[PDB]
Design an enzyme around this catalytic site. Structure first.
Site, mmCIF file in Angstrom:
data_model
loop_
_atom_site.group_PDB
_atom_site.id
_atom_site.type_symbol
_atom_site.label_atom_id
_atom_site.label_comp_id
_atom_site.label_asym_id
_atom_site.label_seq_id
_atom_site.Cartn_x
_atom_site.Cartn_y
_atom_site.Cartn_z
ATOM 1 N N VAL A 109 0.466 -1.475 -0.227
ATOM 2 C CA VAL A 109 0.057 -0.246 0.388
ATOM 3 C C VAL A 109 0.845 1.090 0.091
ATOM 4 O O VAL A 109 0.767 1.991 -0.574
ATOM 5 C CB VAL A 109 -0.876 0.611 1.209
ATOM 6 C CG1 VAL A 109 -1.739 1.299 0.708
ATOM 7 C CG2 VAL A 109 -2.396 -1.000 0.443
ATOM 8 N N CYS A 110 1.711 0.804 0.903
ATOM 9 C CA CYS A 110 2.963 2.183 0.983
ATOM 10 C C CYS A 110 3.747 2.762 -0.339
ATOM 11 O O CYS A 110 3.416 3.391 -0.463
ATOM 12 C CB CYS A 110 3.862 0.918 2.053
ATOM 13 S SG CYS A 110 3.349 1.047 3.605
ATOM 14 N N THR A 111 4.119 1.506 -1.383
ATOM 15 C CA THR A 111 4.286 1.701 -2.378
ATOM 16 C C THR A 111 3.653 2.847 -3.518
ATOM 17 O O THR A 111 4.090 3.478 -3.667
ATOM 18 C CB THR A 111 5.076 0.093 -2.238
ATOM 19 O OG1 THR A 111 5.473 -0.023 -1.606
ATOM 20 C CG2 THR A 111 5.911 0.735 -3.807
#
Lengths: 220, 219
Positions: free
Chosen positions: A46-48
């Site tokens: 998600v962070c990516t």
């Protein structure tokens, strides 16, 4: 203060991605709006996707005199390596967003942005998906705390910023689902006599059953 | 001091549409809940938000999610303003209870005060808060928008769908995710446990770091 609306966002010094020395917030955001955003862990999906999206949108923020500052409880070495994944995923060729390091969790504890569940490989807690919209006067204008499970809406971040900047200078408030170019609301305290001074365009009044005169729109 | 994972406190207050006391835990028992505040009744942005949430009320109820309104206005103010909201939204009824906090006790406890907004009496008003509450009374997500900035009502629903999905399934939703889109497999879920949780296949995206975290799944 309590990091609630209108409080002063505190200055800090920290290590950051892409820079060898100390990153100081107040020096970086001087005379600028700023959005500080956290993410739980480097090298997570998600962070990516979020960081790849904000990296694409970077120029849209910068042209609005707004800085973007990333933040996680990971090391600088983790940030720099992870950036290469973000660039590859997002088809980016130039990373510009400083990502602050908070390995000790001192800043995450002070800001009260810790995630409910998320922990790293060492068993230590990680931050949630926070957002702080900060004015050129260091005031916290708006906040969001999304959990690690829920990726943010990057369009919403730019939309909030445009509303905060418009309402900062003009006596208007933006209605539900407002987008730049849509009509906004005249603040309810602005008297009919004061209208001409502030607005070049005609106000649209919508009559209410209560007969109060608060439902006023303006196309700027 | 109501942050992520903390228990949302119970309260008793007056509310619109009912003549008795509104007790939070009784209304939200075995339900997801969204507690939302607005600065003042009879103001333009607040009318547009509440007409929109009124229109979307069945979308929330179908997902077993209660919507609870809140302002520092009296009940009498709420009941009269509801008729303006109904007119603006072209609604025939109103079913969202709007809580009263005239004393500012709940607003000071929840720390939802607006930076600038004050009423005719010179007293402060709340900002545009959102508390997304689980059936276990846990605060899953929060938002604090100022009085100057109307919320995105579609975003409230998108977030609720993401919280409900990830509550039961080992997934996390990516940036800009909408219901029906592929989501991410949690980075800790090992290959062995993958078939127990997912009927459909996983898509693996190769990263320069050679780490195996970038996995998508269509549910």
């Amino acid at each position: 203060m309590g990091y609630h609306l209108g409080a002063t966002f505190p200055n800090f010094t920290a290590k950051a991605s892409g820079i060898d020395g100390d990153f100081e917030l107040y020096k970086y955001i001087e005379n600028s709006w700023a959005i500080l955003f956290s993410h739980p862990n480097d090298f997570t999906p998600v962070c990516t996707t979020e960081l790849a999206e904000l990296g694409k949108m970077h120029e849209d923020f910068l042209k609005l005199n707004c800085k973007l500052i990333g933040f996680s409880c990971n090391s600088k070495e983790s940030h720099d390596k992870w950036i290469e994944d973000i660039k590859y995923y997002g088809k980016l060729n130039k990373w510009e967003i400083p990502i602050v390091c908070d390995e000790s969790r001192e800043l995450a504890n002070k800001l009260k942005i810790m995630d409910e569940q998320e922990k790293d490989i060492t068993g230590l807690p990680l931050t949630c998906r926070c957002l702080f919209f900060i004015s050129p006067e260091k005031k916290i204008k708006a906040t969001v705390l999304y959990p690690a499970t829920t990726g943010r809406n990057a369009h919403e971040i730019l939309r909030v910023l445009k509303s905060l900047q418009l309402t900062y200078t003009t006596p208007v408030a933006t209605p539900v689902n407002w987008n730049e170019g849509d009509k906004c609301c005249v603040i309810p305290t602005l008297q009919d006599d004061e209208i001409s001074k502030h607005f070049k365009n005609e106000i649209t009044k919508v009559e209410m059953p209560s007969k109060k005169k608060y439902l006023r729109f303006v196309n700027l």
